[PDB]
Amino acid sequence: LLGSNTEYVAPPMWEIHHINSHSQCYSSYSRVIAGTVFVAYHRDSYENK
Amino acid sequence: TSMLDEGIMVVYKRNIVAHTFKVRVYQKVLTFRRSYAYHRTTY
Ligand SMILES: *[C@@H]1O[C@H](CO)[C@@H](O)[C@H](O)[C@H]1NC(C)=O
């Protein structure tokens, strides 16, 4: 067993609009920092369901 | 035309001092530091 970072993040506004008009979120966070965009997925290698 | 019980009194509060008692808390603390190694300067 090793570490466990956990960070709390605001969704993007397009997603806010999705959330509260469909009762569902996308299984991916994406934020750009410096140059490139970074991205996380729910279970590994998942799609954007 | 011309023209009062006596006694002893003890007063009591409602009491507000909340009840204290000690509690044992068992827990473990795992800490993970991480480092790099080049020449003699550990990052
Ligand atoms: C997931 O889908 C939304 C809309 O379908 C899109 O805006 C978002 O960029 C996608 N995320 C990816 C592909 O990582």
From Swiss-Prot, chain B:
Residues 35-41 are annotated as: Involved in fusion and/or binding to host membrane. It comes from the Viruses. It is found in: Virion membrane; Host cell membrane; Host endosome membrane; Host Golgi apparatus membrane. A proteolytic cleavage by host furin generates two subunits that remain linked by disulfide bonds. Belongs to the herpesviridae glycoprotein B family. Envelope glycoprotein that plays a role in host cell entry, cell to-cell virus transmission, and fusion of infected cells. May be involved in the initial attachment via binding to heparan sulfate together with the gM/gN complex that binds heparin with higher affinity. Interacts with host integrin ITGB1, PDGFRA and EGFR that likely serve as postattachment entry receptors. Also participates in the fusion of viral and cellular membranes leading to virus entry into the host cell. Membrane fusion is mediated by the fusion machinery composed at least of gB and the heterodimer gH/gL. Homotrimer; disulfide-linked. Binds to heparan sulfate proteoglycans. Interacts with gH/gL heterodimer. Interacts with host C-type lectin CD209/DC-SIGN. Interacts with host ITGB1, EGFR, and PDGFRA. This is Envelope glycoprotein B. It comes from Human cytomegalovirus (strain Towne). The gene is gB. The chain holds residues 112 to 160 of 907 of the full protein.
